[PDB]
Design a protein around this ligand. Structure first.
Ligand code: HEM
Ligand SMILES: *[C@@H]1O[C@H](CO)[C@@H](O[C@@H]2O[C@H](CO)[C@@H](O)[C@H](O)[C@H]2NC(C)=O)[C@H](O)[C@H]1NC(C)=O
Ligand SMILES: *[C@@H]1O[C@H](CO)[C@@H](O)[C@H](O)[C@H]1NC(C)=O
Ligand SMILES: *[C@@H]1O[C@H](CO)[C@@H](O)[C@H](O)[C@H]1NC(C)=O
Ligand SMILES: *[C@@H]1O[C@H](CO)[C@@H](O)[C@H](O)[C@H]1NC(C)=O
Ligand SMILES: [Ca+2]
Ligand SMILES: [Cl-]
Ligand SMILES: [K+]
Ligand SMILES: [Zn+2]
Ligand SMILES: [Zn+2]
Length: 595
């Protein structure tokens, strides 16, 4: 609320109700309600927002005001007391590859983005926030607690800007602040293509009628394509190594260059689109560029859907997969397709799956050169290590043969993210993602832990003893109670991640329920779901069923050896097979003549 830095450009389109293609914005998916799921609308609220003043001020804004009669603990202080740990030994997930973590970030970026308020460029507001740690309007700084080492080294706070929100509209009667989702709620490869028509065009190759995406014209990966550079300045990716001065990539998603392995995945996906287009041009020489672009975009969309539901969700949701996502029963035009506010915090479980280092491996999956293993923080906004240090293949190999971090109640978020995160506007490897997540929960008016437990029909701990029983962990419960006084006040991000994981899964009960429900809706509420009859032919669906991430790698790199199950932990060579033995996508069902 209170208008400063609100709104987004929602472009009005008349719906082509008969198009076999998704729109870019996500409009027209739901025929009765064409905006449901579209980009640049409010996140859905599963429960009403909870703000200090009932409208817009986050809990923790006014020093005097309590939450349920208790002060809320500083976000950095929760992080120090609970989230950090020293020893990386034994922290790794023994049955999940690094690809597990990375795929999660990909799915997340496809579904939701809540950009920070653009106070504008040229800001004295940035100055008053960063330099003076002054709370006001969109500046909601993360203040360091007493004895924080960052006090001695960084200042009084980390700057933090409140998320973007829907503008008050002409009733202007009083409503709670609603944050915006800038990307389409459908699992539709929007992170590749854009959620905005203008960028979508700019990303395409329109010089040729071949339906390709634009590729870098200054650099190649042993003949294979790189994303175009983003030429907007100043560039964080340039900042981190001004000698090398390699800019960030330009993708369908703003966040693509945040870390080297995300940039990698974005590259594999772009390569795939162009491969699909070239193949379809071979099968159908008469098809034009629009047709080629749309059809390859349509396939790549389904590819993301299949990998997520067949390979990813089962090993996240474990024993709960069946309870939340039973066999598909066809498109339901009454299901809300929109991403919920709470989901965007629930999906941040992946922050506990990121390890402290990244490795480049050679063709024998051995350490590549003398600086094979790098600390994670050196790779935020890092495109030079790709362009000028060996391409994507060495990184892809580590994705396959290295492991995700396991979530650990005693070892939650690695120091690389908890102390050394680099933010694109700022200049220091000095931020705390865990403190940011907690602050952001408050920013977004998140109801508290016991609110969500109830939403999910789970017991709601009220005492230390009750929480110890929920957490199966005495010390964690006690530290939580000392900080929060009441489990009612525990911020949803820390609360949900504190729970021991469900059987065969990588999240606890509360999170399994929140994620499960959202993924159910994402499938059932999508008119272009790949399994919705008429979206693909039957023969095409039979082809699609054979897609795998291993094939994507084989088709789009010079790696010739891959595991069959890329998401589990795999060791070279025993678990790797030659690419020739891996199922391909058969495109013959897309062949199209007139006779
Ligand atoms: C750097 C960051 C990562 C890797 C080194 C990383 C990783 C993940 C995974 C694996 C996720 C899902 C399984 C995931 C989800 C979401 N993230 Fe997170 N992430 C890195 C950095 C960030 C930053 C910075 C943010 C913004 C924090 C803020 O509130 O201002 C961030 C957010 C999220 C998020 C909310 C929406 C979004 O931007 O993705 C997730 C669902 N991540 N990340
Ligand atoms: C857009 O598509 C055209 C045509 O495929 C690309 O042009 C060719 O690019 C390759 C690689 O640079 C060359 O080997 C060919 O000789 C080029 N042929 C033509 C028709 O010029 C062009 O590079 C693509 N543009 C972008 C920006 O991705
Ligand atoms: C790793 O997880 C997958 C889950 O589908 C399972 O099939 C595989 O056997 C697991 N390996 C283990 C638990 O060691
Ligand atoms: C910057 O890149 C150059 C090569 O471009 C390299 O030799 C140097 O180590 C890099 N410096 C930093 C700051 O990482
Ligand atoms: C579809 O959606 C609504 C709300 O989820 C539900 O009541 C209804 O039972 C569903 N109908 C079918 C046919 O699945
Ligand atoms: Ca999307
Ligand atoms: Cl919500
Ligand atoms: K993110
Ligand atoms: Zn090569
Ligand atoms: Zn700064």
């Amino acid at each position: 609320s209170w208008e400063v830095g609100c709104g987004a450009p929602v472009p009005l389109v008349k719906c082509d109700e008969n198009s076999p293609y998704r729109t870019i914005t996500g409009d027209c998916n739901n025929r009765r309600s064409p905006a449901l799921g579209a980009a640049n609308r409010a996140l859905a609220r599963w429960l009403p927002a909870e703000y200090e003043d009932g409208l817009a001020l986050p809990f923790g804004w006014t020093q005097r005001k309590t939450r349920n009669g208790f002060r809320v603990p500083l976000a950095r202080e929760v992080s120090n007391k609970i989230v950090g740990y020293l020893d990386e030994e034994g922290v790794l997930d023994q049955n999940r590859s690094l690809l597990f973590m990375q795929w999660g970030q990909i799915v997340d970026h496809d579904l939701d983005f809540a950009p920070e308020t653009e106070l504008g460029s040229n800001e004295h507001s940035k100055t008053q926030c960063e330099e003076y740690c002054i709370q006001g309007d969109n500046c909601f700084p993360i203040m360091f607690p007493k004895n924080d080492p960052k006090l001695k080294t960084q200042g009084k706070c980390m700057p933090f800007f409140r998320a973007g929100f829907v503008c008050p509209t002409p009733p202007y009667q009083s409503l709670a602040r609603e944050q915006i989702n800038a990307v389409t709620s459908f699992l539709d490869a929007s992170l590749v293509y854009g959620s905005e028509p203008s960028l979508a065009s700019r990303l395409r190759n329109l010089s040729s009628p071949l339906g390709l995406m634009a590729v870098n014209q200054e650099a190649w990966d042993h003949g294979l394509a790189y994303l175009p550079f983003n030429n907007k300045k100043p560039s964080p990716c340039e900042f981190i190594n001004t000698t090398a001065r390699v800019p960030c990539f330009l993708a369908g998603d703003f966040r693509a260059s945040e870390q080297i392995l995300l940039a990698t995945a974005h590259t594999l996906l772009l390569r795939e689109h162009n491969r699909l287009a070239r193949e379809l041009k071979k099968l159908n020489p008469h098809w034009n560029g629009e047709k080629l672009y749309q059809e390859a975009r349509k396939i790549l969309g389904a590819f993301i859907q299949i990998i997520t539901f067949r390979d990813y969700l089962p090993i996240v949701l474990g024993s709960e997969m069946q309870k939340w996502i039973p066999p598909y029963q066809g498109y339901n035009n009454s299901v809300d397709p929109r991403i919920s506010n709470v989901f965007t915090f629930a999906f941040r479980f992946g922050h506990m799956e990121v390890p402290s280092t990244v490795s480049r491996l050679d063709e024998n999956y051995q350490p590549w050169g003398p600086e094979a293993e790098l600390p994670l923080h050196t790779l935020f906004f890092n495109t030079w290590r790709i362009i000028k240090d060996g391409g994507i293949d060495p990184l892809v190999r580590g994705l396959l043969a290295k492991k995700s971090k396991l979530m650990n109640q005693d070892k939650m978020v690695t120091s690389e993210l908890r102390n050394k995160l680099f933010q694109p506007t700022h200049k220091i490897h000095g931020f705390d993602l865990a403190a940011i997540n907690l602050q952001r929960c408050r920013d977004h008016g998140m109801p508290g832990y016991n609110s969500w437990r109830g939403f999910c029909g789970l017991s709601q701990p009220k005492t230390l003893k009750g929480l110890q029983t929920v957490l199966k962990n005495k010390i964690l419960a006690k530290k939580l109670m000392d900080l929060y006084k009441t489990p009612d006040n525990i911020d949803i991000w820390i609360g949900g991640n504190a729970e021991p994981m469900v059987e065969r899964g990588r999240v606890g009960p509360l999170l399994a329920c929140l994620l499960g429900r959202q993924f159910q809706q994402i499938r059932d509420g999508d008119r272009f779901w790949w399994e919705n009859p008429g979206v693909f032919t039957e023969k095409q669906r039979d082809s699609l069923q054979k897609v795998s991430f291993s094939r994507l790698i084989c088709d789009n790199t010079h790696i010739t050896k891959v595991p069959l199950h890329a998401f589990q932990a795999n060791n070279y060579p025993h678990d790797f097979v030659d690419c020739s033995t891996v199922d391909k996508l058969d495109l013959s069902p897309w062949a199209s003549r007139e006779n």
